[PDB]
Design a protein around this ligand. Sequence first.
Ligand SMILES: Nc1ncnc2c1ncn2[C@@H]1O[C@H](COP(=O)(O)OP(=O)(O)O)[C@@H](O)[C@H]1O
Lengths: 472, 89, 191, 89, 212, 142
Amino acid sequence: GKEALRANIAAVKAIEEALKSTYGPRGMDKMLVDSLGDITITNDGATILDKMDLQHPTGKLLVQIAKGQTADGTKTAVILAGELAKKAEDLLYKEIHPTIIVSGYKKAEEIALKTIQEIAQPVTINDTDVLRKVALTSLGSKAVAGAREYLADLVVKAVAQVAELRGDKWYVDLDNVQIVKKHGGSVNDTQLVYGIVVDHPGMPKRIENAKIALLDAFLEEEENILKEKVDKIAATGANVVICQKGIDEVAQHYLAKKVRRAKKSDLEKLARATGGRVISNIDELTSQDLGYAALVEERKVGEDKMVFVEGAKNPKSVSILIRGGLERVVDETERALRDALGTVADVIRDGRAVAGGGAVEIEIAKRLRKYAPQVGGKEQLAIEAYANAIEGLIMILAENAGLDPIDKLMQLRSLHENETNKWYGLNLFTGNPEDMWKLGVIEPALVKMNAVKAATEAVTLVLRIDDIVAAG
Amino acid sequence: EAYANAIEGLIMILAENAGLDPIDKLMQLRSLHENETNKWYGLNLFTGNPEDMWKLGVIEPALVKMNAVKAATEAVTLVLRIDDIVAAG
Amino acid sequence: GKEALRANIAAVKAIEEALKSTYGPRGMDKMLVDSLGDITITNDGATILDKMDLQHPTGKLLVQIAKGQTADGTKTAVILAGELAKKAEDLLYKEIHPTIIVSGYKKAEEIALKTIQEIAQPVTINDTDVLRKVALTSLGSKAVAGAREYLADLVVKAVAQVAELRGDKWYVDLDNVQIVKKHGGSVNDTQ
Amino acid sequence: EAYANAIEGLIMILAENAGLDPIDKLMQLRSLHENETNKWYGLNLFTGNPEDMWKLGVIEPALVKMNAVKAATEAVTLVLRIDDIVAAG
Amino acid sequence: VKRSDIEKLEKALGARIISSIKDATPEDLGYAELVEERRVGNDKMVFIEGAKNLKAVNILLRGSNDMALDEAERSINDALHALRNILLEPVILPGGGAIELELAMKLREYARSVGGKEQLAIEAFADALEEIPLILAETAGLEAISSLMDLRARHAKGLSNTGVDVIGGKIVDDVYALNIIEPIRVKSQVLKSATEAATAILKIDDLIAAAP
Amino acid sequence: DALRNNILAAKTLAEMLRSSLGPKGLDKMLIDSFGDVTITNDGATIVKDMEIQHPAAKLLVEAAKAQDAEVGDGTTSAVVLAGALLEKAESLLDQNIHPTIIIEGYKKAYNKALELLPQLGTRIDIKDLNSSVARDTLRKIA
Ligand SMILES: Nc1ncnc2c1ncn2[C@@H]1O[C@H](COP(=O)(O)OP(=O)(O)O)[C@@H](O)[C@H]1O
């Protein structure tokens, strides 16, 4: 059923083309258009793939795959899978059975992962320059309005807190990072807080050693019931009370005499940080479900009130306030910062880093070409094709910078004949090849490995499927 | 100025016919010709890079260049001077 | 954006053409047709511009302008503006920037007002023949059924009452004039 | 000058609405108004010939004329000042 | 006096509206440096000067007509805003498009010392600035071309203050002499936002259909 | 191509406010869809109240609105300029120059100009009104 396969390959190629030009540290932006008419301008690939109007099953699948295990790297996986698909197509026209191409690609994947594992430069949490570089790596091309060397600082400072070593590996519980945003000034007004932050005259403000009530949950009778509900909570010794559902202002008065938030993604991290737990029904509420916060308080953002939970019990607590002008700015800042956090977190947790600019890529290709003749006939071609498909990334990376792809590919290929140039990659601003390690173009080995892995998996899935059937 | 650009067009096309990037090489040569001592530097098409064209034996008669310029100028001015075309007898 | 300007000029020219033939003391009448089918035959330009089916923004604007500060004179303003627009068009074809034409027209306006101020013959409330003449002036071409020299009398008599002098100028509070109508006989029964 | 012509247009149209030849009467009045002593002469539409409009009781308020001129000028300048039309909210 | 007036007065004057004098006290007593019955266009008025929290300076705007009134108010407002803008950053620039031309010259000079395709990108930034003199003169009905070359001539061979007087509709050798001045605070911001805009437009590759 | 469309959108928008520049800035007539109108040569008013069509143009509007927000005087001047930059960019695109290059070039040019602004600026004297130096300056700017 070639007719069903070609459509899959076309879908993959379509998504590649969708995310292609976004790639690199000079990646152009895409303009997403909602059917409403509203729009979203962005560089980040994950966001695109999220808001993107997915058509094909294989497409939605591919997206589902590229996002699996770390926000970034998706870009790489997608484009790589696209290249592999195209080269697979080229191989298919030569009447080569898919089960051969798959096997070849698998071998190539193994050799690739060996290659990355071999090249990788071990790093530690102490090598902060590396962390900074890795942070700054993804931050390039984000169109963030400056403060890259400051946002990177915030990242490096952020990951440092959320880290504790039980044994050999620090348990960087990334999920403890709260992220909010507001307008005004610029991203220089961005700032960290140790505790979680959340965007009537009410209850008191500065609570020291605060117990925090975390709760997701004829008229006269209802009043009695509601007051009963409030008193129940009051009888547990709760300093500050948090909710998600709408609270009757009468209960606000009551409690004031004793916020409703909006999102549970905050209440989550609040429960994480404070040490308390959420309750579905206040009838079950106790005094141990209350979270401990050593110095809770509230502060004014230039245009708005904002809640601060400082002095949270848990050591691994952290939040960041984002600031800027337009929505696109603060959003791109958010997503970029997420990417940074991801990359750095993976660097820390894994403890290995490599050079960008496509050094690892041309190295992997270089290796594959050597290993290719050592196996059978038809597989060798698949492996070679795999290598080429990898080089495609360098080429596209060159394209997105306004450079001639082939020339730079050949240059790097020529340079990587020396053992001592295994870090050399493409300086896109300069235009010439350079040692990407000194320029702080560093990325987590785990990201590269995962990208390769997921792309391979995706393409093999594309090739393994012979036909598409409607079921029930 | 337009005349100058039109002249540079020749270098650009010359770069094109060799499978090179026109603008880059133009800019390169332009940058090189800021020095009095590089007044011979031109484009090595096989090499791909700018080089002193005199040592490489890329030499041509001045009269040819002059005549080319002259005739081209004459042609274009003729094109511009003519306002309309009329059938006569 | 000539394309947007020409449309304006065309609108003004259209309204001019609408009110053109109504002009003068022999001005023809226009027949207004409501979508209901009902009609209104009239010479008065203001009335036309009121009941008229206005299309263009610049049009409605022009009407809004011609009626601002005195019912009559609107005719003149409209048609004049039309002529000025046409001649402006003629000037525009000669590649002359509007800000020049405007300035020129402004100067011309100043000189015009100087001219009218210069020519003008001072008159008083006592020169009743003048009042009668001025009354009769606009009354011509109205297709009113006679009694022009009587309606003019009523006018002259009317304005006389509504007039009191605080200082240099009589405060003719025109808004004190009630106007009603009924059928029967002719306009000689007006009173 | 165009302004002046545009003003004369009124006399012409006034002649038209009376079933008279516009240009001839315009020229006549123009010729007559070379004399300081004919500054009142206008067009008798019923008679068909130019005559002193003051004796015939063809009198109007200066303020009306002034206002007409003023408003027309304002209108046309407004028409000319506006470059494009835009839909707002 | 009106309630709205007295209410304004008491807070500045540091006084309090006494409901009853029997219960009054010097606590409710206000103070001002000077008070004077002054003549203002044959209309006597009580003036109060420098009292407590001076806050704003009060203008009595005598308009013979609502038009001239609102016109004067408008004028004062605009003047104040502009003077504020220049005062915030005490550096003036030669308006009438002069500074744009100067920048263009300097930016071409600067573009020369950069190579590659970027030499053409900067030069193209300069060619854009020069559209302001071009357009700005064109509004005055001057030829969009000859004016610009005349400017270039006067500029490259003369003072940087050579610009365009749109009011008078003529090219001026020195625009400071014609009192054509532009604040730097505005200009830099204009430059900034313009660059940001054009950038953001150029940076967008293509459009993609999305889901709300 | 889509880029060129965006460029054309922003450009075509800028073309309109080209005439509304400076003292002799021609008028623009805004039709309030409620059945009302307001005319002006003001960038802020126009850009604000107008209901823009194309996204790119809307983004340019956004930029202009920011430009107004930061300071009131110059708004149109920014839009016309942006349009000019894009118009000059589309000529370089025809030179087959990748957008990112143009972008960096424009960034550098902007930074240099920004640096040059004060260099070419004439600083003034604000040392009191006793002297009347400030008055002369204030008179000129007035
Ligand atoms: N400063 C840089 N110089 C050269 N290449 C870079 C640089 N920064 C990132 N890259 C390359 O970009 C690729 C990743 O790009 P992309 O996924 O689009 O952005 P992000 O890293 O933010 O996810 C990597 O393959 C890496 O080699």
